[PDB]
DNA sequence: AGTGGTGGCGCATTATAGGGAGTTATTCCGGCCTGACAAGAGGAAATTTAAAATAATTTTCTG
């Protein structure tokens, strides 16, 4: 449910909700496999971080038909 | 009048941005081949003038 909770943010960037939740699942798995409890870092933040890092990356890249650099998106 | 509470700083934790490294892909820099000019040579068509002949003018001779 955490992935679902964070996903509902990105809900209008030309992306089927389910694709969003899927990208979030990939990011969460990546965080879990990379999560470090011994490095000294709040687990939940680490997770959510990766979640966003994946979701925003996916929307930036595959949202628009003509793919556009991400810094350009930030400019917009 | 004392024990706790408040604020500020410290310690520990948390979050965010920039820089370095890579990597790709566009873009500048240089040599070398095309392309243009200037010249030179040998041989051949064209043009011009001089000389030689037919058809007309002038003079002379004949009827």
Whole-number Å distance between alpha carbons of A60 and A54: 10
Chain Cα centroid distance, residue A49: 8
Q: Taking the alpha carbons of A55, A60, A63, A67 in that order, is the dihedral positive or negative?
A: negative
CA A14 to CA A10: how far, in whole Å? 10
Q: CA(A35)–C1'(B12) in Å?
A: 20
- Tokens for A59, please give them: 């929307």
3-state secondary structure of A36: coil
Listed in sequence order, the DSSP H helices in A1-76 are 2-7, 17-34, 43-62, 70-75
Token pair for A23: 């990208």
Technique behind the model: cryo-EM
Q: Given in angstroms, what resolution was this structure solved at?
A: 4.1
d(CA A54, CA A39): 22
CA distance A40 to A47: 14
* Coil, helix or strand at residue A63: coil
For residue A53, say whether its CB is under 7 Å from any atom of strand B.
no
């Amino acid at each position: 449910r955490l992935v679902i909770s964070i996903a509902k943010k990105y809900t209008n960037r030309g992306l089927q909700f389910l694709d969003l939740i899927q990208e979030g699942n990939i990011g969460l798995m990546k965080a879990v496999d990379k999560f470090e409890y011994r490095r000294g870092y709040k687990f939940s933040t680490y997770a959510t971080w990766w979640i966003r890092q994946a979701i925003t990356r996916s929307i930036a890249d595959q949202a628009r038909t003509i793919r556009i650099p991400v810094h350009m998106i930030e400019t917009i």
